[PDB]
Paper text:
The MORF protein is a core catalytic subunit of the native complex which bears the same name (MORF) and has been implicated in acetylation of histone H3 and H4 5,6. The MORF subunit consists of the NEMM (N-terminal part of Enok, MOZ or MORF) domain, the double PHD finger (DPF), the MYST domain, and the ED (glutamate/aspartate-rich) and SM (serine/methionine-rich) regions. The DPF module of MORF has been shown to bind histone H3 tail acylated at lysine 14 (H3K14acyl). In this study, we show that the native MORF complex, containing BRPF1, ING4/5 and MEAF6, acetylates H3K23 and that this catalytic activity is coupled to binding of the DPF domain of MORF to another acylated, particularly crotonylated, modification—H3K14cr.
Numbering used by the authors:
A (entry chain A): 210 to 320
B (entry chain D): 1 to 16
The structure:
């Protein structure tokens, strides 16, 4: 769905983030909801990575490997490089422990 | 790692 030109968190346009400063929105490819990266708390390089991809918001995000949410969707990991979501049991290899700190998905890792 | 839960709280709520 086409982007909603308003940030879901601060209701500002791309012309006024929470600091009343211009900042382009990220927009969910599935539901069209948008957010300023500053409002989403994304770091700059995550932001520039997400801009080049088909991004889903937190609520729309399905696991990139198995393509479902499922009953334990709240514990799906988000890639610190690309914001893709992965269930623990769908990681490479499947994880039985929640990673502490930075985690990067299989899509972003080198071949 | 960031999860759907940590991200949702990290941002705070959507505007009502
Ligand atoms: Zn905002
Ligand atoms: Zn969405
Ligand atoms: Zn999965
Ligand atoms: Zn990634």
């Amino acid at each position: 769905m086409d982007p909603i030109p308003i940030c879901s968190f601060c209701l500002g346009t791309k012309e006024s983030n929470r600091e009343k400063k211009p900042e382009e929105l990220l927009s969910c490819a599935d539901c069209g909801s948008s957010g300023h990266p500053s409002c989403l708390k994304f770091c700059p390089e995550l932001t520039t990575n997400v801009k080049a991809l088909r991004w889903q918001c937190i609520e729309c995000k399905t696991c990139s490997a198995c393509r479902v949410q499922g009953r334990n969707a709240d514990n799906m990991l988000f890639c610190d490089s690309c914001d893709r979501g992965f269930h623990m049991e769908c990681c490479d290899p499947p994880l039985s422990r929640m990673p502490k700190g930075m985690w990067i998905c299989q899509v972003c890792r080198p071949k | 790692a960031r999860t759907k839960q940590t991200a949702r709280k990290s941002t705070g709520g959507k505007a009502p």
